Design a protein around this ligand. Structure first.
Ligand code: EX1
Length: 124
């Protein structure tokens, strides 16, 4: 079975929207979300549908852009670093589970390069 997905709201977690978090939603997430390689990353890994009995034995910190998008829309994060870390976790999980040269790894690397370009333009 699949684990429960990562939470996207938490009634006890303080909320904030800094100018950097605004940029992360309106520029960074939006740019990656519309990219041709976004589709594997727009929702949690469905280990049932993909028949991956070991995925959630290996990956204990799952993350995906659908979760990040909802977190940003909900003002779930306090700071930009929490959101940046979620993106980095998502890419890292792909690199852990898969192998060099797999199509999905090359897709993740292309999205990560674009992510890094856009993050370098974060407002100060
Ligand atoms: C919408 O959800 C999906 C749909 C389909 C699908 O069957 N289709 C139809 C054909 C389309 N193709 C047609 C041909 N075009 C050239 C491109 C589009 C594309 C869409 C396949 C996978 C989906 N989700 C998915 N999420 C995260 C993954 C992942 N898969 N992969 C694969 C992507 C490797 C992994 C596989 C195994 C283990 C780990 C992963 C993994 O790391 N990650 C992040």
């Amino acid at each position: 079975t699949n684990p429960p997905p990562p939470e996207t709201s938490n009634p006890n977690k303080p909320k904030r929207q800094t100018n950097q978090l605004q940029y992360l939603l309106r520029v960074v997430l939006k740019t990656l979300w519309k990219h041709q390689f976004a589709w594997p990353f727009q929702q949690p890994v469905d280990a049932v549908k993909l028949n991956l009995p070991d995925y959630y034995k290996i990956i204990k910190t799952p993350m995906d852009m659908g979760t990040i998008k909802k977190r940003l829309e909900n003002n779930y994060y306090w700071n930009a670093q929490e959101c940046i870390q979620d993106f980095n976790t998502m890419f890292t999980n792909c690199y852990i589970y898969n192998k060099p040269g797999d199509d999905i790894v090359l897709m993740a690397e292309a999205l990560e390069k674009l992510f890094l370009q856009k993050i370098n333009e974060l407002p100060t």
